[PDB]
mmCIF file of N, CA and C and ligand atoms in Angstrom:
data_model
loop_
_atom_site.group_PDB
_atom_site.id
_atom_site.type_symbol
_atom_site.label_atom_id
_atom_site.label_comp_id
_atom_site.label_asym_id
_atom_site.label_seq_id
_atom_site.Cartn_x
_atom_site.Cartn_y
_atom_site.Cartn_z
ATOM 1 N N UNK A 1 -11.778 113.474 165.761
ATOM 2 C CA UNK A 1 -11.796 114.875 165.484
ATOM 3 C C UNK A 1 -11.475 115.109 163.988
ATOM 4 N N UNK A 2 -11.436 116.428 163.643
ATOM 5 C CA UNK A 2 -11.180 116.766 162.282
ATOM 6 C C UNK A 2 -9.881 116.225 161.798
ATOM 7 N N UNK A 3 -8.770 116.188 162.593
ATOM 8 C CA UNK A 3 -7.525 115.585 162.119
ATOM 9 C C UNK A 3 -7.617 114.132 161.702
ATOM 10 N N UNK A 4 -8.360 113.353 162.496
ATOM 11 C CA UNK A 4 -8.564 111.934 162.186
ATOM 12 C C UNK A 4 -9.367 111.796 160.918
ATOM 13 N N UNK A 5 -10.335 112.724 160.684
ATOM 14 C CA UNK A 5 -11.125 112.593 159.482
ATOM 15 C C UNK A 5 -10.265 112.868 158.267
ATOM 16 N N UNK A 6 -9.307 113.736 158.337
ATOM 17 C CA UNK A 6 -8.368 113.925 157.257
ATOM 18 C C UNK A 6 -7.484 112.807 157.047
ATOM 19 N N UNK A 7 -6.970 112.203 158.073
ATOM 20 C CA UNK A 7 -6.285 110.890 157.925
ATOM 21 C C UNK A 7 -7.191 109.941 157.156
ATOM 22 N N UNK A 8 -8.483 109.856 157.510
ATOM 23 C CA UNK A 8 -9.340 108.809 156.956
ATOM 24 C C UNK A 8 -9.844 109.183 155.510
ATOM 25 N N UNK A 9 -10.135 110.482 155.266
ATOM 26 C CA UNK A 9 -10.837 110.808 154.051
ATOM 27 C C UNK A 9 -9.984 111.672 153.078
ATOM 28 N N UNK A 10 -8.848 112.300 153.651
ATOM 29 C CA UNK A 10 -8.116 113.330 152.991
ATOM 30 C C UNK A 10 -7.461 112.820 151.718
ATOM 31 N N UNK A 11 -7.428 113.754 150.687
ATOM 32 C CA UNK A 11 -6.727 113.478 149.428
ATOM 33 C C UNK A 11 -5.271 113.792 149.566
ATOM 34 N N UNK A 12 -4.409 112.956 149.009
ATOM 35 C CA UNK A 12 -2.947 113.236 149.102
ATOM 36 C C UNK A 12 -2.591 114.156 147.917
ATOM 37 N N UNK A 13 -2.237 115.375 148.272
ATOM 38 C CA UNK A 13 -2.076 116.393 147.208
ATOM 39 C C UNK A 13 -0.644 116.631 146.965
ATOM 40 N N UNK A 14 0.248 115.756 147.525
ATOM 41 C CA UNK A 14 1.654 115.870 147.245
ATOM 42 C C UNK A 14 1.960 115.239 145.851
ATOM 43 N N UNK A 15 2.986 115.810 145.207
ATOM 44 C CA UNK A 15 3.561 115.280 143.978
ATOM 45 C C UNK A 15 4.176 113.901 144.206
ATOM 46 N N UNK A 16 4.939 113.687 145.318
ATOM 47 C CA UNK A 16 5.519 112.416 145.518
ATOM 48 C C UNK A 16 4.551 111.324 146.060
ATOM 49 N N UNK A 17 3.321 111.674 146.349
ATOM 50 C CA UNK A 17 2.329 110.728 146.843
ATOM 51 C C UNK A 17 2.839 110.028 148.074
ATOM 52 N N UNK A 18 3.262 110.923 149.023
ATOM 53 C CA UNK A 18 3.798 110.475 150.333
ATOM 54 C C UNK A 18 2.894 110.790 151.519
ATOM 55 N N UNK A 19 1.668 111.158 151.192
ATOM 56 C CA UNK A 19 0.671 111.497 152.264
ATOM 57 C C UNK A 19 1.222 112.609 153.173
ATOM 58 N N UNK A 20 2.201 113.436 152.620
ATOM 59 C CA UNK A 20 2.729 114.529 153.490
ATOM 60 C C UNK A 20 1.753 115.616 153.732
ATOM 61 N N UNK A 21 0.784 115.794 152.786
ATOM 62 C CA UNK A 21 -0.196 116.893 152.845
ATOM 63 C C UNK A 21 -1.492 116.235 152.384
ATOM 64 N N UNK A 22 -2.396 116.169 153.307
ATOM 65 C CA UNK A 22 -3.723 115.603 153.090
ATOM 66 C C UNK A 22 -4.768 116.718 153.211
ATOM 67 N N UNK A 23 -5.757 116.651 152.325
ATOM 68 C CA UNK A 23 -6.749 117.697 152.191
ATOM 69 C C UNK A 23 -8.169 117.175 152.118
ATOM 70 N N UNK A 24 -9.080 117.777 152.928
ATOM 71 C CA UNK A 24 -10.511 117.657 152.640
ATOM 72 C C UNK A 24 -11.058 119.068 152.415
ATOM 73 N N UNK A 25 -11.883 119.175 151.353
ATOM 74 C CA UNK A 25 -12.622 120.321 151.082
ATOM 75 C C UNK A 25 -13.835 120.341 151.986
ATOM 76 N N UNK A 26 -13.989 121.416 152.821
ATOM 77 C CA UNK A 26 -15.078 121.473 153.743
ATOM 78 C C UNK A 26 -16.176 122.343 153.196
ATOM 79 N N UNK A 27 -15.891 123.373 152.405
ATOM 80 C CA UNK A 27 -16.881 124.102 151.722
ATOM 81 C C UNK A 27 -16.265 124.475 150.347
ATOM 82 N N UNK A 28 -17.042 124.134 149.290
ATOM 83 C CA UNK A 28 -16.508 124.327 147.897
ATOM 84 C C UNK A 28 -16.479 125.874 147.646
ATOM 85 N N UNK A 29 -15.491 126.271 146.796
ATOM 86 C CA UNK A 29 -15.430 127.698 146.454
ATOM 87 C C UNK A 29 -16.069 128.027 145.172
ATOM 88 N N UNK A 30 -15.620 129.054 144.477
ATOM 89 C CA UNK A 30 -16.350 129.695 143.394
ATOM 90 C C UNK A 30 -15.379 129.887 142.230
ATOM 91 N N UNK A 31 -15.864 129.628 141.015
ATOM 92 C CA UNK A 31 -15.124 129.725 139.740
ATOM 93 C C UNK A 31 -14.183 128.552 139.537
ATOM 94 N N UNK A 32 -13.262 128.731 138.538
ATOM 95 C CA UNK A 32 -12.365 127.734 138.215
ATOM 96 C C UNK A 32 -10.901 128.082 138.734
ATOM 97 N N UNK A 33 -10.547 129.396 138.830
ATOM 98 C CA UNK A 33 -9.187 129.823 139.046
ATOM 99 C C UNK A 33 -8.750 129.437 140.451
ATOM 100 N N UNK A 34 -7.519 128.840 140.476
ATOM 101 C CA UNK A 34 -6.800 128.675 141.725
ATOM 102 C C UNK A 34 -5.487 129.505 141.567
ATOM 103 N N UNK A 35 -4.858 129.908 142.687
ATOM 104 C CA UNK A 35 -3.828 130.936 142.644
ATOM 105 C C UNK A 35 -2.539 130.400 142.018
ATOM 106 N N UNK A 36 -1.790 131.353 141.445
ATOM 107 C CA UNK A 36 -0.530 131.052 140.715
ATOM 108 C C UNK A 36 0.586 131.459 141.641
ATOM 109 N N UNK A 37 1.724 130.786 141.564
ATOM 110 C CA UNK A 37 2.971 131.344 142.167
ATOM 111 C C UNK A 37 3.136 132.863 141.863
ATOM 112 N N UNK A 38 3.329 133.562 143.013
ATOM 113 C CA UNK A 38 3.516 134.973 143.032
ATOM 114 C C UNK A 38 2.217 135.737 143.458
ATOM 115 N N UNK A 39 1.058 135.092 143.391
ATOM 116 C CA UNK A 39 -0.166 135.841 143.724
ATOM 117 C C UNK A 39 -0.149 136.159 145.232
ATOM 118 N N UNK A 40 -0.791 137.389 145.491
ATOM 119 C CA UNK A 40 -0.946 137.750 146.812
ATOM 120 C C UNK A 40 -2.183 137.042 147.263
ATOM 121 N N UNK A 41 -2.123 136.317 148.418
ATOM 122 C CA UNK A 41 -3.194 135.483 148.843
ATOM 123 C C UNK A 41 -3.696 135.932 150.246
ATOM 124 N N UNK A 42 -5.036 136.040 150.403
ATOM 125 C CA UNK A 42 -5.641 136.424 151.636
ATOM 126 C C UNK A 42 -6.413 135.202 152.194
ATOM 127 N N UNK A 43 -6.144 134.884 153.471
ATOM 128 C CA UNK A 43 -6.845 133.769 154.165
ATOM 129 C C UNK A 43 -7.214 134.099 155.553
ATOM 130 N N UNK A 44 -8.122 133.381 156.033
ATOM 131 C CA UNK A 44 -8.405 133.100 157.489
ATOM 132 C C UNK A 44 -7.942 131.672 157.753
ATOM 133 N N UNK A 45 -7.402 131.443 158.931
ATOM 134 C CA UNK A 45 -6.914 130.129 159.288
ATOM 135 C C UNK A 45 -6.964 129.926 160.869
ATOM 136 N N UNK A 46 -7.104 128.601 161.152
ATOM 137 C CA UNK A 46 -6.858 128.134 162.523
ATOM 138 C C UNK A 46 -5.865 126.990 162.388
ATOM 139 N N UNK A 47 -4.856 126.971 163.207
ATOM 140 C CA UNK A 47 -3.870 125.963 163.140
ATOM 141 C C UNK A 47 -3.542 125.437 164.525
ATOM 142 N N UNK A 48 -3.196 124.147 164.552
ATOM 143 C CA UNK A 48 -2.811 123.519 165.861
ATOM 144 C C UNK A 48 -1.800 122.381 165.607
ATOM 145 N N UNK A 49 -1.082 122.038 166.690
ATOM 146 C CA UNK A 49 -0.319 120.843 166.680
ATOM 147 C C UNK A 49 -1.342 119.717 166.706
ATOM 148 N N UNK A 50 -1.094 118.616 166.027
ATOM 149 C CA UNK A 50 -2.120 117.564 165.755
ATOM 150 C C UNK A 50 -2.796 117.103 167.061
ATOM 151 N N UNK A 51 -1.998 117.110 168.173
ATOM 152 C CA UNK A 51 -2.479 116.833 169.480
ATOM 153 C C UNK A 51 -2.996 117.941 170.310
ATOM 154 N N UNK A 52 -3.005 119.176 169.825
ATOM 155 C CA UNK A 52 -3.567 120.412 170.424
ATOM 156 C C UNK A 52 -2.770 120.960 171.663
ATOM 157 N N UNK A 53 -1.467 121.147 171.584
ATOM 158 C CA UNK A 53 -0.738 121.777 172.719
ATOM 159 C C UNK A 53 -0.549 123.288 172.393
ATOM 160 N N UNK A 54 -0.773 123.741 171.208
ATOM 161 C CA UNK A 54 -0.554 125.084 170.694
ATOM 162 C C UNK A 54 -1.618 125.266 169.604
ATOM 163 N N UNK A 55 -2.409 126.400 169.707
ATOM 164 C CA UNK A 55 -3.477 126.743 168.809
ATOM 165 C C UNK A 55 -3.259 128.196 168.327
ATOM 166 N N UNK A 56 -3.462 128.502 167.034
ATOM 167 C CA UNK A 56 -3.212 129.871 166.518
ATOM 168 C C UNK A 56 -4.329 130.131 165.455
ATOM 169 N N UNK A 57 -4.865 131.357 165.564
ATOM 170 C CA UNK A 57 -6.030 131.683 164.751
ATOM 171 C C UNK A 57 -5.963 133.196 164.246
ATOM 172 N N UNK A 58 -6.014 133.370 162.905
ATOM 173 C CA UNK A 58 -6.076 134.704 162.313
ATOM 174 C C UNK A 58 -7.287 135.436 162.793
ATOM 175 N N UNK A 59 -8.338 134.681 163.176
ATOM 176 C CA UNK A 59 -9.580 135.306 163.682
ATOM 177 C C UNK A 59 -9.301 136.079 164.940
ATOM 178 N N UNK A 60 -8.339 135.666 165.752
ATOM 179 C CA UNK A 60 -7.943 136.430 166.927
ATOM 180 C C UNK A 60 -7.310 137.816 166.548
ATOM 181 N N UNK A 61 -6.699 137.963 165.423
ATOM 182 C CA UNK A 61 -6.258 139.286 164.961
ATOM 183 C C UNK A 61 -7.406 140.053 164.312
ATOM 184 N N UNK A 62 -8.538 139.411 164.108
ATOM 185 C CA UNK A 62 -9.729 140.064 163.428
ATOM 186 C C UNK A 62 -9.416 140.484 162.040
ATOM 187 N N UNK A 63 -8.413 139.819 161.366
ATOM 188 C CA UNK A 63 -8.042 140.368 160.029
ATOM 189 C C UNK A 63 -7.395 139.227 159.274
ATOM 190 N N UNK A 64 -7.425 139.289 157.917
ATOM 191 C CA UNK A 64 -6.842 138.156 157.139
ATOM 192 C C UNK A 64 -5.386 138.056 157.324
ATOM 193 N N UNK A 65 -4.800 136.845 157.059
ATOM 194 C CA UNK A 65 -3.429 136.605 156.955
ATOM 195 C C UNK A 65 -3.100 136.628 155.466
ATOM 196 N N UNK A 66 -2.012 137.377 155.088
ATOM 197 C CA UNK A 66 -1.711 137.612 153.725
ATOM 198 C C UNK A 66 -0.299 137.182 153.385
ATOM 199 N N UNK A 67 -0.120 136.457 152.236
ATOM 200 C CA UNK A 67 1.208 136.037 151.859
ATOM 201 C C UNK A 67 1.230 135.851 150.384
ATOM 202 N N UNK A 68 2.526 135.857 149.869
ATOM 203 C CA UNK A 68 2.737 135.632 148.458
ATOM 204 C C UNK A 68 2.928 134.123 148.197
ATOM 205 N N UNK A 69 2.128 133.521 147.339
ATOM 206 C CA UNK A 69 2.159 132.054 147.181
ATOM 207 C C UNK A 69 3.458 131.624 146.518
ATOM 208 N N UNK A 70 4.038 130.577 147.044
ATOM 209 C CA UNK A 70 5.013 129.783 146.331
ATOM 210 C C UNK A 70 6.408 130.287 146.511
ATOM 211 N N UNK A 71 6.537 131.275 147.410
ATOM 212 C CA UNK A 71 7.819 131.906 147.754
ATOM 213 C C UNK A 71 8.395 131.269 148.979
ATOM 214 N N UNK A 72 7.815 130.229 149.552
ATOM 215 C CA UNK A 72 8.324 129.694 150.833
ATOM 216 C C UNK A 72 8.236 130.590 152.049
ATOM 217 N N UNK A 73 7.385 131.673 151.974
ATOM 218 C CA UNK A 73 7.031 132.610 153.057
ATOM 219 C C UNK A 73 6.236 131.966 154.180
ATOM 220 N N UNK A 74 5.720 130.858 153.761
ATOM 221 C CA UNK A 74 5.003 129.926 154.690
ATOM 222 C C UNK A 74 5.569 128.537 154.564
ATOM 223 N N UNK A 75 5.142 127.576 155.448
ATOM 224 C CA UNK A 75 5.577 126.172 155.326
ATOM 225 C C UNK A 75 5.191 125.656 153.938
ATOM 226 N N UNK A 76 5.968 124.594 153.420
ATOM 227 C CA UNK A 76 5.763 124.042 152.120
ATOM 228 C C UNK A 76 4.295 123.571 151.936
ATOM 229 N N UNK A 77 3.723 122.996 152.966
ATOM 230 C CA UNK A 77 2.321 122.454 152.968
ATOM 231 C C UNK A 77 1.366 123.521 152.536
ATOM 232 N N UNK A 78 1.597 124.795 152.977
ATOM 233 C CA UNK A 78 0.707 125.806 152.596
ATOM 234 C C UNK A 78 0.867 126.251 151.176
ATOM 235 N N UNK A 79 2.096 126.342 150.677
ATOM 236 C CA UNK A 79 2.350 126.638 149.342
ATOM 237 C C UNK A 79 1.685 125.593 148.409
ATOM 238 N N UNK A 80 1.735 124.346 148.790
ATOM 239 C CA UNK A 80 1.110 123.253 148.015
ATOM 240 C C UNK A 80 -0.418 123.299 148.168
ATOM 241 N N UNK A 81 -0.943 123.456 149.371
ATOM 242 C CA UNK A 81 -2.315 123.337 149.738
ATOM 243 C C UNK A 81 -3.156 124.501 149.259
ATOM 244 N N UNK A 82 -2.712 125.677 149.545
ATOM 245 C CA UNK A 82 -3.471 126.892 149.146
ATOM 246 C C UNK A 82 -3.509 126.973 147.642
ATOM 247 N N UNK A 83 -2.487 126.503 146.933
ATOM 248 C CA UNK A 83 -2.437 126.509 145.475
ATOM 249 C C UNK A 83 -3.558 125.633 144.862
ATOM 250 N N UNK A 84 -4.140 124.702 145.679
ATOM 251 C CA UNK A 84 -5.168 123.909 145.169
ATOM 252 C C UNK A 84 -6.577 124.480 145.358
ATOM 253 N N UNK A 85 -6.680 125.633 146.095
ATOM 254 C CA UNK A 85 -7.945 126.051 146.627
ATOM 255 C C UNK A 85 -8.518 127.158 145.722
ATOM 256 N N UNK A 86 -9.907 127.123 145.576
ATOM 257 C CA UNK A 86 -10.673 128.136 144.919
ATOM 258 C C UNK A 86 -11.062 129.269 145.845
ATOM 259 N N UNK A 87 -11.350 130.448 145.289
ATOM 260 C CA UNK A 87 -11.827 131.535 146.065
ATOM 261 C C UNK A 87 -13.132 131.146 146.840
ATOM 262 N N UNK A 88 -13.216 131.491 148.147
ATOM 263 C CA UNK A 88 -14.389 131.042 148.967
ATOM 264 C C UNK A 88 -14.265 129.608 149.542
ATOM 265 N N UNK A 89 -13.278 128.785 149.117
ATOM 266 C CA UNK A 89 -13.076 127.434 149.593
ATOM 267 C C UNK A 89 -12.611 127.505 151.064
ATOM 268 N N UNK A 90 -13.143 126.526 151.893
ATOM 269 C CA UNK A 90 -12.554 126.200 153.162
ATOM 270 C C UNK A 90 -12.114 124.738 153.060
ATOM 271 N N UNK A 91 -10.888 124.523 153.569
ATOM 272 C CA UNK A 91 -10.259 123.224 153.420
ATOM 273 C C UNK A 91 -9.620 122.911 154.821
ATOM 274 N N UNK A 92 -9.521 121.566 155.092
ATOM 275 C CA UNK A 92 -8.681 121.055 156.216
ATOM 276 C C UNK A 92 -7.455 120.420 155.627
ATOM 277 N N UNK A 93 -6.306 120.763 156.208
ATOM 278 C CA UNK A 93 -4.988 120.145 155.884
ATOM 279 C C UNK A 93 -4.470 119.502 157.133
ATOM 280 N N UNK A 94 -3.945 118.301 156.906
ATOM 281 C CA UNK A 94 -3.164 117.567 157.843
ATOM 282 C C UNK A 94 -1.778 117.383 157.276
ATOM 283 N N UNK A 95 -0.709 117.649 158.025
ATOM 284 C CA UNK A 95 0.584 117.925 157.460
ATOM 285 C C UNK A 95 1.697 117.184 158.208
ATOM 286 N N UNK A 96 2.314 116.203 157.570
ATOM 287 C CA UNK A 96 3.508 115.565 158.151
ATOM 288 C C UNK A 96 4.713 116.510 158.285
ATOM 289 N N UNK A 97 5.650 116.270 159.228
ATOM 290 C CA UNK A 97 6.640 117.136 159.555
ATOM 291 C C UNK A 97 7.558 117.611 158.422
ATOM 292 N N UNK A 98 7.740 116.726 157.399
ATOM 293 C CA UNK A 98 8.564 116.976 156.263
ATOM 294 C C UNK A 98 8.050 118.223 155.526
ATOM 295 N N UNK A 99 6.738 118.564 155.591
ATOM 296 C CA UNK A 99 6.123 119.610 154.817
ATOM 297 C C UNK A 99 5.808 120.829 155.755
ATOM 298 N N UNK A 100 6.282 120.677 156.962
ATOM 299 C CA UNK A 100 6.040 121.768 157.996
ATOM 300 C C UNK A 100 7.427 122.194 158.567
ATOM 301 N N UNK A 101 7.716 121.752 159.797
ATOM 302 C CA UNK A 101 8.942 122.221 160.526
ATOM 303 C C UNK A 101 9.987 121.135 160.695
ATOM 304 N N UNK A 102 9.707 119.849 160.215
ATOM 305 C CA UNK A 102 10.757 118.934 160.099
ATOM 306 C C UNK A 102 11.214 118.328 161.342
ATOM 307 N N UNK A 103 12.487 117.739 161.258
ATOM 308 C CA UNK A 103 13.148 117.219 162.329
ATOM 309 C C UNK A 103 13.649 118.311 163.344
ATOM 310 N N UNK A 104 14.063 119.441 162.815
ATOM 311 C CA UNK A 104 14.527 120.518 163.639
ATOM 312 C C UNK A 104 13.370 121.134 164.458
ATOM 313 N N UNK A 105 12.225 121.166 163.965
ATOM 314 C CA UNK A 105 11.120 121.949 164.531
ATOM 315 C C UNK A 105 11.285 123.446 164.472
ATOM 316 N N UNK A 106 10.638 124.141 165.439
ATOM 317 C CA UNK A 106 10.799 125.588 165.577
ATOM 318 C C UNK A 106 10.588 125.910 167.028
ATOM 319 N N UNK A 107 11.553 125.477 167.869
ATOM 320 C CA UNK A 107 11.379 125.494 169.260
ATOM 321 C C UNK A 107 11.548 126.935 169.765
ATOM 322 N N UNK A 108 10.823 127.359 170.870
ATOM 323 C CA UNK A 108 10.088 126.395 171.709
ATOM 324 C C UNK A 108 8.633 126.238 171.239
ATOM 325 N N UNK A 109 8.211 126.989 170.251
ATOM 326 C CA UNK A 109 6.802 126.937 169.770
ATOM 327 C C UNK A 109 6.430 125.584 169.169
ATOM 328 N N UNK A 110 7.268 125.013 168.293
ATOM 329 C CA UNK A 110 6.920 123.829 167.618
ATOM 330 C C UNK A 110 7.964 122.791 167.845
ATOM 331 N N UNK A 111 7.596 121.592 168.356
ATOM 332 C CA UNK A 111 8.630 120.551 168.542
ATOM 333 C C UNK A 111 9.111 119.883 167.285
ATOM 334 N N UNK A 112 10.199 119.182 167.433
ATOM 335 C CA UNK A 112 10.701 118.248 166.448
ATOM 336 C C UNK A 112 9.612 117.274 166.012
ATOM 337 N N UNK A 113 9.596 117.031 164.690
ATOM 338 C CA UNK A 113 8.783 115.989 164.106
ATOM 339 C C UNK A 113 7.284 116.141 164.411
ATOM 340 N N UNK A 114 6.866 117.413 164.335
ATOM 341 C CA UNK A 114 5.464 117.764 164.597
ATOM 342 C C UNK A 114 4.581 117.598 163.387
ATOM 343 N N UNK A 115 3.417 116.998 163.559
ATOM 344 C CA UNK A 115 2.263 116.986 162.635
ATOM 345 C C UNK A 115 1.380 118.168 162.991
ATOM 346 N N UNK A 116 1.009 118.914 161.928
ATOM 347 C CA UNK A 116 0.168 120.120 162.015
ATOM 348 C C UNK A 116 -1.180 119.895 161.362
ATOM 349 N N UNK A 117 -2.214 120.568 161.907
ATOM 350 C CA UNK A 117 -3.528 120.662 161.264
ATOM 351 C C UNK A 117 -3.922 122.109 161.056
ATOM 352 N N UNK A 118 -4.527 122.371 159.935
ATOM 353 C CA UNK A 118 -5.126 123.688 159.689
ATOM 354 C C UNK A 118 -6.480 123.579 159.118
ATOM 355 N N UNK A 119 -7.345 124.569 159.484
ATOM 356 C CA UNK A 119 -8.478 124.924 158.709
ATOM 357 C C UNK A 119 -8.204 126.240 158.057
ATOM 358 N N UNK A 120 -8.398 126.317 156.659
ATOM 359 C CA UNK A 120 -8.039 127.483 155.911
ATOM 360 C C UNK A 120 -9.238 127.860 155.071
ATOM 361 N N UNK A 121 -9.554 129.198 155.086
ATOM 362 C CA UNK A 121 -10.496 129.823 154.219
ATOM 363 C C UNK A 121 -9.756 130.720 153.275
ATOM 364 N N UNK A 122 -9.881 130.434 151.924
ATOM 365 C CA UNK A 122 -9.229 131.262 150.953
ATOM 366 C C UNK A 122 -10.266 132.426 150.636
ATOM 367 N N UNK A 123 -9.861 133.639 151.113
ATOM 368 C CA UNK A 123 -10.810 134.717 150.925
ATOM 369 C C UNK A 123 -10.641 135.380 149.541
ATOM 370 N N UNK A 124 -9.403 135.503 149.109
ATOM 371 C CA UNK A 124 -9.121 136.227 147.880
ATOM 372 C C UNK A 124 -7.664 135.939 147.425
ATOM 373 N N UNK A 125 -7.397 136.139 146.117
ATOM 374 C CA UNK A 125 -6.015 136.204 145.630
ATOM 375 C C UNK A 125 -6.000 137.103 144.446
ATOM 376 N N UNK A 126 -4.847 137.846 144.324
ATOM 377 C CA UNK A 126 -4.698 138.889 143.382
ATOM 378 C C UNK A 126 -3.276 138.748 142.757
ATOM 379 N N UNK A 127 -3.150 139.113 141.488
ATOM 380 C CA UNK A 127 -1.866 139.082 140.759
ATOM 381 C C UNK A 127 -0.735 139.926 141.418
ATOM 382 N N UNK A 128 0.509 139.412 141.283
ATOM 383 C CA UNK A 128 1.734 140.068 141.671
ATOM 384 C C UNK A 128 1.543 141.552 141.264
HETATM 385 C C1 LIG B 201 6.990 128.950 163.441
HETATM 386 O O1 LIG B 201 6.437 130.163 163.998
HETATM 387 C C2 LIG B 201 5.122 130.383 163.763
HETATM 388 C C3 LIG B 201 4.172 129.454 163.293
HETATM 389 C C4 LIG B 201 2.846 129.759 163.320
HETATM 390 C C5 LIG B 201 2.393 131.011 163.702
HETATM 391 C C6 LIG B 201 3.315 131.950 164.145
HETATM 392 C C7 LIG B 201 4.655 131.621 164.219
HETATM 393 O O2 LIG B 201 5.507 132.559 164.780
HETATM 394 C C8 LIG B 201 5.949 133.435 163.792
HETATM 395 O O3 LIG B 201 3.044 133.227 164.575
HETATM 396 C C9 LIG B 201 1.744 133.546 165.113
HETATM 397 C C10 LIG B 201 1.473 135.020 164.939
HETATM 398 C C11 LIG B 201 0.404 135.432 165.990
HETATM 399 C C12 LIG B 201 1.001 135.416 163.612
HETATM 400 N N1 LIG B 201 1.953 134.996 162.593
HETATM 401 C C13 LIG B 201 1.892 133.918 161.691
HETATM 402 C C14 LIG B 201 3.019 134.008 160.950
HETATM 403 N N2 LIG B 201 3.738 135.083 161.401
HETATM 404 N N3 LIG B 201 3.076 135.626 162.337
HETATM 405 C C15 LIG B 201 3.559 133.164 159.833
HETATM 406 C C16 LIG B 201 4.747 132.357 160.357
HETATM 407 C C17 LIG B 201 4.920 131.097 159.555
HETATM 408 O O4 LIG B 201 3.867 130.128 159.792
HETATM 409 C C18 LIG B 201 3.614 129.236 158.789
HETATM 410 O O5 LIG B 201 4.228 129.054 157.855
HETATM 411 C C19 LIG B 201 2.219 128.494 159.136
HETATM 412 C C20 LIG B 201 1.224 128.722 157.995
HETATM 413 C C21 LIG B 201 0.853 130.088 157.987
HETATM 414 C C22 LIG B 201 0.093 130.378 159.307
HETATM 415 C C23 LIG B 201 1.077 130.155 160.501
HETATM 416 N N4 LIG B 201 1.809 128.912 160.422
HETATM 417 C C24 LIG B 201 2.173 128.163 161.552
HETATM 418 O O6 LIG B 201 2.974 127.197 161.432
HETATM 419 C C25 LIG B 201 1.801 128.663 162.874
HETATM 420 C C26 LIG B 201 1.751 127.524 163.893
HETATM 421 C C27 LIG B 201 0.578 126.549 163.511
HETATM 422 C C28 LIG B 201 0.476 125.414 164.532
HETATM 423 C C29 LIG B 201 0.173 125.922 165.962
HETATM 424 C C30 LIG B 201 1.271 126.905 166.346
HETATM 425 C C31 LIG B 201 1.510 127.970 165.345
#
């Protein structure tokens, strides 16, 4: 599946080069700019536990998910991953627990030491 493909092909976009956050670009975006810390960011996403016991999709709300980048309002993997993305880009992220919910997890929704996958489409980003 797409998770395995990210294991196999994904670029390690972590600073420590610990394979914590792996990325494949599925559709290239537009322009040169990627978002800065503080930018308001609009996305569509689908997320799941790597083994598929919980699935979550902004498409089910029929509206974008919006967050301020780099403020830790989302898991670290997103702050790192969305920061690499161009407007219009769709990317797959595979995320080790250290960059998601860790040893503690987020029970009952997310177990301890969970690996997460997401598909993310960066719709837009605008200055603070
Ligand atoms: C740990 O709790 C959650 C995790 C996740 C989604 C959660 C959630 O309950 C707060 O709610 C789903 C709800 C319908 C819409 N939504 C998203 C968020 N807040 N409300 C953002 C919450 C923080 O989530 C994240 O940082 C990441 C990246 C942004 C998108 C949501 N994220 C998730 O971790 C998801 C989980 C993905 C794997 C499958 C289970 C949900």
